[PDB]
Design a protein around this ligand. Structure first.
Ligand SMILES: COc1cc2sc(C(=O)CCC(=O)O)cc2cc1CCCc1cc2cc(C(=O)CCC(=O)O)sc2cc1OC
Lengths: 178, 178
């Protein structure tokens, strides 16, 4: 299926390359002299899985209580002819009643953004019903992959949701479960 | 199909973001004071499409006549919560009888690398026959997408091949056709 291919390639081609290096990047950030007077950034990459495929590029636009804090130090790796291919990731503070309640590395799974966009292209022959069905399957397959890869599972958390809705409250429940 | 999803997401989620900015990056590189005594880097992104899905990370390993020259200046964009997500791309000199015959921006389509890798994971339930069939379909679908997007088509060239084989000679035929 479309979802099976996307979930496996997102895992092999992105998560499997960044998750073994994430812990050390977070620790480097947390131990840096410019960051010692702030709360520690939580371990793990928090992956947003909107089942409606509504993927904005700016997280603060989807919820004002999600405030951009900083970028992690970048990771580089030679990848398929791209020398020093750069992996950047962003740190966000989660606000509860105007107060900092948590800090974590957060992003959306970009194949959910491309699934939404595919349904809009006449040439793709991909309906809104296809988009909905494949987005759910993408999330299920990604869960199945990560469950059987404990090394990858311990360094990430999948945040699935349907869409007043509070995205910050959803991230905070996962952040507090730890 | 697996190939349909991967070709559309690679286009929407990568090529459509870098191809509108490539010309200006190449021109900036070609006009830079450190590069005026070298031959101009060709326009267009050259995408390697091995139909056998053999995707090495180092291009000089697949062919010694493909020599790394430099990285283009990076492009950054906010992407799905990743602030200043970095797009890096590499410039290679193509050697013919120990002599520089062409210079271009080159890389493999990374979904061909993930299709090869998928066939190796028991959990993916994806055979070597599936890998071969889907790799061909991925290449065909990517060609179909780019043909009907003239803005994207003028900034890239698809290099498909089956695998003594000379990868540099294959890139040079496309480079000289222009
Ligand atoms: C090889 O397959 C993938 C690689 C990646 S790398 C990646 C990210 O870096 C996440 C952030 C982003 O998409 O910009 C997501 C994916 C997803 C996939 C599977 C879906 C197709 C796809 C390809 C792709 C290729 C990309 C590259 O940057 C090329 C170099 C590389 O793959 O590292 S971004 C991208 C996004 C894609 O879908 C959203």
């Amino acid at each position: 299926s479309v979802a099976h291919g996307l979930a496996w390639s997102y895992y092999i081609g992105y998560l499997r390359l960044i998750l073994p290096e994430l812990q050390a990047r977070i620790r480097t950030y947390n131990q840096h002299y410019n960051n010692l007077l702030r709360g520690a950034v939580s371990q793990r990459l928090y992956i947003l899985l909107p089942l409606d495929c509504g993927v904005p590029d700016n997280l603060s636009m989807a919820d004002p209580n999600i405030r951009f804090l900083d970028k992690l130090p970048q990771q580089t790796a030679d990848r398929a002819g791209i020398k020093d291919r750069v992996y950047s990731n962003s740190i966000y503070e989660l606000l509860e009643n105007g107060q900092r309640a948590g800090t974590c590395v957060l992003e959306y799974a970009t194949p959910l953004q491309t699934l939404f966009a595919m349904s809009q292209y006449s040439q793709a022959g991909f309906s809104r019903e296809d988009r909905l069905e494949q987005a759910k399957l993408f999330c299920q397959t990604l869960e199945d992959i990560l469950a059987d890869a404990p090394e990858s599972q311990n360094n990430c958390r999948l945040i699935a949701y349907q869409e007043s809705f509070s995205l910050s409250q959803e991230v905070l429940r996962h952040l507090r479960q730890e």
